[PDB]
Amino acid sequence: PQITLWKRPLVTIKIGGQLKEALLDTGADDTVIEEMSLPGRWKPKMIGGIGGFIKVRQYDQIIIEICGHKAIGTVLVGPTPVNIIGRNLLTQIGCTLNF
Amino acid sequence: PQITLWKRPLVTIKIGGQLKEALLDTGADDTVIEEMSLPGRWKPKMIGGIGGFIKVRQYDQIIIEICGHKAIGTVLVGPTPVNIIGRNLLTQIGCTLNF
Numbered sequence A, B: 001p002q003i004t005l006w007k008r009p010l011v012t013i014k015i016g017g018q019l020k021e022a023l024l025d026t027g028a029d030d031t032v033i034e035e036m037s038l039p040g041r042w043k044p045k046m047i048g049g050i051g052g053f054i055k056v057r058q059y060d061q062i063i064i065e066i067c068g069h070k071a072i073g074t075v076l077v078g079p080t081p082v083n084i085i086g087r088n089l090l091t092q093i094g095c096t097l098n099f
């Protein structure tokens, strides 16, 4: 598909057996999701942006589905104000910027 | 061009006759640049990011070139960690997400 930028590029994702709305975010290195349970080991991480840093839990090798496209990668879980799909997963679905 | 997301989508912009590096950011509603001098009057704006809020100065109808493409629009100036080109200008340059 081709997604315009007149409004926020929000999509439905499937993660940890749950459906969530998330922002396709080329400005995010990492994928960051609001509080939820994920299986497996995790380690703490600090991530920064506008307004400073938040502490998150880093889960590796998590399967996500974004627009019928399956991918695997690291997912950070924490007090993000919006669910964000970052570049680590956008690359896997073959997402590019075009102009 | 077609920009992949294996690396940060950093481009050169030109504003106030000076070249700067900025991030093409689909997750940003607005364009936010680090402290610099811009002409005219500014208005106050509050922007919310990952770690909270920053107060910025809103300048309207500013001439800015993004990856060689000419745009004229709103530029926010404040303590952002990186220069960000948001959807207000990505739409002016005809940028879309594609997969």
Ligand SMILES: C[C@H]1Cc2cc(F)ccc2S(=O)(=O)N(C[C@@H](O)[C@H](Cc2ccccc2)NC(=O)OC(C)(C)C)C1
Residues within 6 Å of the ligand: A025, A026, A027, A028, A029, A030, A031, A032, A047, A048, A049, A050, A080, A081, A082, A084, A086, B025, B026, B027, B028, B029, B030, B032, B047, B048, B049, B050, B051, B081, B082, B084, B086
């Ligand atoms: C430079 C980036 C740093 C960063 C790096 C990551 F690995 C993950 C998230 C983030 S972020 O801090 O989240 N962000 C991505 C932005 O796309 C962000 C997404 C977002 C939107 C709404 C609330 C919280 C985060 N928009 C953003 O900061 O927008 C403004 C404040 C620039 C307008 C900026």
